[PDB]
Write a protein that binds this DNA or RNA. Structure first.
Ligand SMILES: Nc1nc2c(ncn2[C@@H]2O[C@H](COP(=O)(O)OP(=O)(O)NP(=O)(O)O)[C@@H](O)[C@H]2O)c(=O)[nH]1
Ligand SMILES: [Mg+2]
Ligand SMILES: [Mg+2]
Ligand SMILES: [Mg+2]
Ligand SMILES: [Mg+2]
Ligand SMILES: [Mg+2]
Ligand SMILES: [Mg+2]
Ligand SMILES: [Mg+2]
Ligand SMILES: [Mg+2]
Ligand SMILES: [Mg+2]
Ligand SMILES: [Mg+2]
Ligand SMILES: [Mg+2]
Ligand SMILES: [Mg+2]
Ligand SMILES: [Mg+2]
Ligand SMILES: [Mg+2]
Ligand SMILES: [Mg+2]
Ligand SMILES: [Mg+2]
Ligand SMILES: [Mg+2]
Ligand SMILES: [Mg+2]
Ligand SMILES: [Mg+2]
Lengths: 325, 154, 216
RNA sequence: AAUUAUAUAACUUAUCUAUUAUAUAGUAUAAGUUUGAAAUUUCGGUUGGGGUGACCUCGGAGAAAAUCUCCGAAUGAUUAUAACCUAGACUUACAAGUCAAAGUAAAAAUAUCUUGACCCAGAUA
RNA sequence: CCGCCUGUUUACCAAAAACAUCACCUCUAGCAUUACAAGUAUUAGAGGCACUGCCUGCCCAGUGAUCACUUGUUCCUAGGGACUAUGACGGCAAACGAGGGUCCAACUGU
RNA sequence: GAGCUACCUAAAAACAAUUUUAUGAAUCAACUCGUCUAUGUGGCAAAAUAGUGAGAAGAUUUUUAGGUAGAGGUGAAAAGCCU
């Protein structure tokens, strides 16, 4: 009677062991040991206060160091130290958000520009959605999540981290509707459409026990995930204005669920709707964050930040798609 | 000769109170369930066992027996008790997650060849990492730190 | 493969592994246990193959009833574990021949090796076949084993010699012209069995019953 | 499985003797702890019947009020801190649950938005 | 085909492939005046298991070579001392059987 | 309540003929058992009859008196036996 985590571990061994070859051992200890958190400042009240204290702890912003307007603090290579819990600031806004450094990369790779309307088709609580608010280059951020409970969390996160003036009536907008239906609701509307599809959440499913995608009863859903992911990605691609950019991000490493999904979407969009979407090179990004990330350089489409005990930031897969017309 | 080595390693066998001597033996026989002859090997092969809190000693046996699959004879023949729990947990767990070790199921079957218990502990850290685990030294050092936190947060 | 002396039986599992890798598994793609199934005609060692692999890999012991005469294993049984590392199970099934064998000769050969109960053929239209092929193929070994005078190609003669050697006789009713009479006679039937049972035991030599059909 | 367990076994502190410089011995008993021979009691519900799963209370939407189709809650943040008293009613097997004039008192009207009985234990005054 | 064999059993639907069995194996016990036993480890008790021959797993510090290093284990503080001279598995043997399948001969009102 | 039955203690009995040998060997009576079929099924019988069978110098069978008692006894384990 294997538990949900047992099945998830069992299923991963047979598949991933072939995908990476001899890196599975390394990638396997990382998922079962612990995670590494990267703190993101709120940029609204303590833009300086939190930065000074964190530096005294020896934590350094990896984004700022790489450039050598998002700034997220992470510890040095191989340092296992933790971040003191976030606190409420003088202005009434939290000091910083603790998130997996990898989650920030998609946002950072989305090439945000000033005066750009941005859509989060499946806006998970905080995470990438909060980071987009941190950057000032937004006009009308939108967020959606098929489930209503998580959005309730999303509103609290925004409230505690975003001043009311910025999150005005039209500045942000939270609607709990289906994502695939979004293909019709809007069209050629949002310049940037960050689409993070619901995924297998490898790291989480191993540790997580409740609501695990690998439960036997939930078999129905697990098989159909690639189909649902394609539809959600298709909906976002239709919505993006001509010449717009979208990023497809996923938490897992299953090639069937990361590399084929984007290629699939391209073919379905190529044929049914007679549109062409061309991928954008991220190799320059690859070379920039070598110091504080561990990714295998064999991904045909997109990039994939595998975990590693030295770094542990992961697992993420972010692909950038530009709509040529 | 058995007394000679035992006395040298553990001079206080004669000087320890009857309480400590009896308690250690009772665990080995009443809880660990070592045969009469095996116990003598434990006393002679690893004299230091006589100075370990009975409960602490019992844990060490349990960890091997249940969470490693070693038989009673395997524990005795390999001088397993002489090692320290801290080192045992680090090396075994490291492999148990790398996928280079597996706990025999009910049937006693394992789908991978577990490396020799000598390889787990007897060899040096550099030998253990290079051959049994084929891993870099740094990653292990990082793992040791993480391991401790889990104990603290256990 | 030779089941009794575990010849070449190791190679089977790697080939099954490699062979499966090329194929698809669909519904069972997630199961980690590789279950394969053994079939064939009776008395080919089908049940023995279970045991030979059962021991060669798992080193456990016999698990399927191995018997000389056809029909020992009747129904499709449950799985029998064979290996642990690939975790390979085997399904054992009863021997099936055909609803209709092709030719009278193939059916005659198929009885030589012991695939079909000999009394369905009589054991007298089959002993003759041995002498033919044994002499034809040149394996003149029965003469030495049965201390026969010299090579021959007549069942009534060889079975006369074999019967005397084994000191076996019957009381058989013969029908003469003045009425039935019971006369002691040498066991032609018993010699045929023993002549068949020596051949099948391999002490009469190695044979290639299908010859000049394989070359072509 | 739950609750026990001077069955045996062990230790520990007393009690009672011996001794001894405080001390190691024992022990017609009491109090603990460990071990467990035993003892007592039980086997929720709904699901052609058997694996597993699941589901069992209340709230929101459809069918449209009988079973079916879907979402959520065992709160959450905001805050002006929202008093006492008392007509008439709603709802309702019981139980629990709703609304509220008048009067008085604080202040200088306002709480906005979206749930578990009894017993028995507590905490402070 | 199964069980080594003579034995044993579900008085009253099961006589057997079950049970016992010599042989083999593991565990426990260093001892007297009521069992074991008026005995003393070539003994006694508890329990497993066909025997014989044949086979192979474990395990058997490493490298120099009876010698030195590297290890290992401990302490004193990353340094300093102290110490370390063969198998658990299979494969098979005649004889016997009111055992369970099968064949032929003879025999017959089946 | 062990006059049945299970096991035990003490004191006693029985085993022809034939062949092997020097025996839990062989053929087969007495004796012990109960394989297969038929009859019987309120029957002669609350387990028998008639045939056919297994053992038959042994771990055999039988006789007498004693022992173990229900939270138990006995058990070459059938959860058998204990009127
Ligand atoms: N010489 C020899 N005999 C073999 C070999 N394999 C099996 N046998 C013999 O074949 C008989 C066993 O057949 P078995 O393994 O039961 O095969 P089966 O096909 O499953 N039997 P069935 O006829 O019931 O279908 C025995 O007589 C056994 O000695 C082999 O490799 N060599
Ligand atoms: Mg009421
Ligand atoms: Mg009023
Ligand atoms: Mg027998
Ligand atoms: Mg007999
Ligand atoms: Mg009966
Ligand atoms: Mg009887
Ligand atoms: Mg009988
Ligand atoms: Mg009977
Ligand atoms: Mg038996
Ligand atoms: Mg019989
Ligand atoms: Mg006939
Ligand atoms: Mg009596
Ligand atoms: Mg006589
Ligand atoms: Mg006799
Ligand atoms: Mg007889
Ligand atoms: Mg006889
Ligand atoms: Mg008896
Ligand atoms: Mg039984
Ligand atoms: Mg009675």
């Amino acid at each position: 009677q294997f538990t949900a985590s047992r099945l998830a571990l069992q299923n991963f061994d047979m598949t991933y062991s072939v995908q990476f070859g001899d890196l599975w051992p390394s990638i396997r200890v990382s998922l079962l040991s612990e995670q590494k958190y990267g703190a993101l400042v709120n940029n609204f009240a303590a833009w300086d206060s939190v930065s000074a204290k964190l530096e005294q702890l020896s934590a350094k912003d990896f984004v700022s160091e790489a450039i050598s307007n998002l700034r997220c603090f992470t510890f040095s290579r191989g340092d296992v130290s933790r971040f003191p819990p976030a606190r409420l600031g003088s202005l009434g806004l939290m000091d910083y958000y603790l998130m997996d450094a990898a989650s920030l990369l998609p946002v950072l790779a989305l090439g945000l520009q000033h005066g750009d309307t941005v859509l989060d088709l499946c806006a998970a609580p905080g995470g990438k959605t909060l980071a987009l608010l941190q950057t000032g280059c937004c006009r009308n951020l939108a967020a959606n999540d098929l489930s209503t409970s998580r959005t309730g969390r999303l509103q609290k996160v925004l409230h505690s981290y975003v001043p009311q003036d910025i999150r005005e009536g039209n500045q942000v907008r939270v609607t709990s509707w289906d994502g695939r239906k979004w293909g019709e609701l809007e069209g050629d509307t949002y310049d940037r459409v960050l689409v993070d599809v619901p995924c297998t959440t490898d790291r989480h499913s191993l540790h997580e026990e409740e609501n695990n995608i690998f439960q036997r009863s939930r078999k129905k859903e697990r098989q159909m995930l690639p189909m649902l992911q394609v539809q959600l990605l298709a909906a976002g691609l239709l919505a993006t204005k001509p010449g717009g950019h979208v990023v497809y991000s996923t938490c897992s490493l299953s090639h069937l669920q990361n590399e084929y999904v984007v290629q699939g979407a391209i073919e379905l969009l190529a044929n049914q709707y007679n549109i062409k979407v061309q991928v954008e090179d991220l190799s320059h990004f690859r070379k920039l964050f070598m110091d504080t990330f561990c990714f295998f350089p064999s991904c045909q489409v997109g990039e994939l930040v595998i975990p590693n005990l030295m770094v542990n930031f992961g697992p993420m897969y972010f692909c950038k798609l530009h709509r040529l017309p | 000769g058995k007394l000679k080595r035992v006395l040298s390693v553990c001079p206080e066998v004669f000087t320890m109170h009857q309480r400590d001597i009896d308690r250690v033996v009772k665990v080995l026989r009443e809880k660990c369930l070592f045969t009469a002859q095996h116990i003598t090997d434990v006393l002679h092969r690893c004299p230091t066992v006589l100075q370990e809190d009975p409960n602490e000693l019992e844990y060490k046996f349990q960890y091997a027996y249940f969470r490693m699959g070693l038989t009673h004879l395997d524990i005795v023949r390999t001088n397993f008790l002489q090692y320290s729990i801290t080192k045992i947990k680090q090396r075994h767990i490291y492999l148990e997650r790398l996928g280079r070790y597996q706990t025999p199921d009910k049937k006693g079957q394992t789908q991978i060849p577990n490396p020799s218990l000598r390889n787990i502990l007897r060899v040096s850290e550099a030998e253990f990492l290079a051959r049994t685990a084929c891993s870099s030294v740094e990653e292990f050092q990082v793992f040791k730190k993480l391991l401790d936190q889990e104990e603290e947060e256990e | 493969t030779n089941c009794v002396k575990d010849e070449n039986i190791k190679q089977i599992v790697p080939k099954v592994m490699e062979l499966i890798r090329c194929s698809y598994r669909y519904h069972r793609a997630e199961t980690p246990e590789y279950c394969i199934m053994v079939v064939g005609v009776p008395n080919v060692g089908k049940s023995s193959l279970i045991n030979s692999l059962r021991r060669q890999h798992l080193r456990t012991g016999k698990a399927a009833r191995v018997g000389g005469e056809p029909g020992i294993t009747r129904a499709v049984t449950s799985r029998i574990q064979v290996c642990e590392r690939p975790l390979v199970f085997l399904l054992d099934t009863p021997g099936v021949l055909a609803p209709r064998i092709e030719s009278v000769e193939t059916g005659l050969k198929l009885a030589l090796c012991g695939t079909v109960l000999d009394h369905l053929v009589g054991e007298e239209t089959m002993a003759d076949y041995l002498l033919y092929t044994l002499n034809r193929h040149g394996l003149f070994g029965y003469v030495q084993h049965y201390a026969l005078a010299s090579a021959c190609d007549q069942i009534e003669w060889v079975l006369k010699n074999v019967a005397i050697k084994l000191r076996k006789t019957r009381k058989v009713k013969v029908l003469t012209g003045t009425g039935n009479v019971n006369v002691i006679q040498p066991d032609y039937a018993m010699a045929a069995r023993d002549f068949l049972r020596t051949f099948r035991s391999g002490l009469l030599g190695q044979v290639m019953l299908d010859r000049d059909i394989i070359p072509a």
